[PDB]
Design an enzyme around this catalytic site. Structure first.
Site, mmCIF file in Angstrom:
data_model
loop_
_atom_site.group_PDB
_atom_site.id
_atom_site.type_symbol
_atom_site.label_atom_id
_atom_site.label_comp_id
_atom_site.label_asym_id
_atom_site.label_seq_id
_atom_site.Cartn_x
_atom_site.Cartn_y
_atom_site.Cartn_z
ATOM 1 N N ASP A 181 0.844 -1.224 0.000
ATOM 2 C CA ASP A 181 0.000 0.000 0.000
ATOM 3 C C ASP A 181 0.872 1.265 0.000
ATOM 4 O O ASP A 181 0.510 2.179 -0.744
ATOM 5 C CB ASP A 181 -0.986 0.008 1.178
ATOM 6 N N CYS A 215 -1.376 -0.038 -13.677
ATOM 7 C CA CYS A 215 -1.508 0.027 -12.209
ATOM 8 C C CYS A 215 -2.729 0.907 -11.968
ATOM 9 O O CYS A 215 -3.723 0.709 -12.734
ATOM 10 C CB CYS A 215 -0.210 0.491 -11.560
ATOM 11 N N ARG A 221 4.306 1.992 -10.843
ATOM 12 C CA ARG A 221 4.604 0.531 -10.891
ATOM 13 C C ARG A 221 4.712 0.090 -12.366
ATOM 14 O O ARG A 221 5.641 -0.642 -12.684
ATOM 15 C CB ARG A 221 3.539 -0.284 -10.141
ATOM 16 N N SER A 222 3.818 0.521 -13.242
ATOM 17 C CA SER A 222 3.857 0.195 -14.689
ATOM 18 C C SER A 222 5.221 0.639 -15.273
ATOM 19 O O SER A 222 5.843 -0.116 -16.078
ATOM 20 C CB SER A 222 2.698 0.871 -15.431
ATOM 21 N N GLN A 262 7.284 7.428 -10.312
ATOM 22 C CA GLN A 262 6.482 8.508 -9.655
ATOM 23 C C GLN A 262 7.250 9.088 -8.452
ATOM 24 O O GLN A 262 6.872 10.205 -8.018
ATOM 25 C CB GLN A 262 5.106 8.007 -9.185
#
Ligand SMILES: Oc1noc2ccccc12
EC number: 3.1.3.48
Length: 284
Positions: A181, A215, A221-222, A262
């Site tokens: 998370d 994602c 994450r991608s 990110q």
């Protein structure tokens, strides 16, 4: 400069934030005019994440051709990826239309439907064999064929039927289920194991259309997934495996979609994954 040494240098100096901001500063900026048309407001999950016009995927319908998806084409590595957002309730039919039209074999999903107590994407695939999904807007049917649940990921076999022509294809759903998370995994072992499962499937290979990766926003994450894949592929092709500059690969990828990676922790995790993955790629 060997990236493992560059890595220890950045870590001992604690300059991850400074490297990361340098990338943000040098990254490409291209127009996203179609994404910002008022007719497309409910086709976008985040107001600040849009596909560039030059690289966006177009839906093959005259109505509205728009989806929040980008084609990343890596010329030397000879790999293509489509990076997209988690489908919305009104874009689930668009999503499967894109999978059909682009001839993708694999879908890679790097998030859970619920994280931090909020919905991060629609339940866009069937959970039971005998309860298939029909997308009336795009005339597709989707059936769960089989499910293989492991500790870190789940693989699903799906059947996608073009109700217009009655052709069917097998789609593989690779679902990475254990990204935390907050922050990033402590070790990349399970992420790398997942990447090698997608590779083994044929989903990343040139005899298919590009893999669809998502994602929640389709940048974080991608981004980490396709940066690591491309860097390891380059380290096998080229005569000097130490020519591979992860920052330069990332800026090349950011010409095709904004915001890939990110946070400074995602950038550090990307280095760790490539360094650890190379200890297979170089003959072990
Ligand atoms: O060091 C290298 N060997 O092969 C290459 C191809 C492209 C860029 C760098 C290199």
């Amino acid at each position: 400069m060997e990236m493992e040494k560059e890595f220890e240098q950045i870590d001992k100096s604690g300059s991850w934030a400074a490297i990361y901001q340098d990338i943000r500063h040098e990254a490409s900026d291209f127009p996203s005019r179609v994404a910002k048309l008022p007719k497309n407001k409910n086709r976008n999950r985040y107001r600040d994440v849009s596909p560039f016009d030059h690289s966006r995927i177009k839906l093959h319908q005259e109505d509205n051709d728009y989806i929040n998806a980008s084609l990343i084409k890596m010329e030397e590595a000879q790999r293509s990826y489509i990076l997209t957002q988690g489908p919305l309730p009104n874009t689930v039919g668009h999503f499967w239309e894109m999978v059909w039209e682009q001839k993708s074999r694999g879908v890679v999903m790097l998030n859970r439907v619920m994280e931090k107590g909020s919905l991060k994407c629609a339940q866009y695939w069937p959970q039971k064999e005998e309860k298939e999904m029909i997308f009336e807007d795009t005339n597709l049917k989707l059936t769960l064929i089989s499910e293989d649940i492991k500790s870190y990921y789940t693989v699903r076999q799906l059947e996608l039927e073009n109700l217009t022509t009655q052709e069917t294809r097998e789609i593989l759903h690779f679902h990475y289920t254990t990204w935390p998370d907050f922050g990033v995994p402590e070790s990349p072992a399970s992420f790398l194991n997942f990447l090698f499962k997608v590779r083994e499937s044929g989903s990343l290979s040139p005899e298919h259309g590009p893999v669809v990766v998502h994602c929640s926003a389709g940048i974080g994450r991608s981004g980490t997934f396709c940066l690591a894949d491309t860097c390891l592929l380059l380290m096998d092709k080229r005569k000097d495996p130490s020519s591979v500059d992860i920052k330069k690969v990332l800026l090349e990828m950011r010409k095709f979609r904004m915001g890939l990676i990110q946070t400074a922790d995602q950038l550090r995790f990307s280095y760790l994954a490539v360094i650890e993955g190379a200890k297979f790629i170089m003959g072990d």
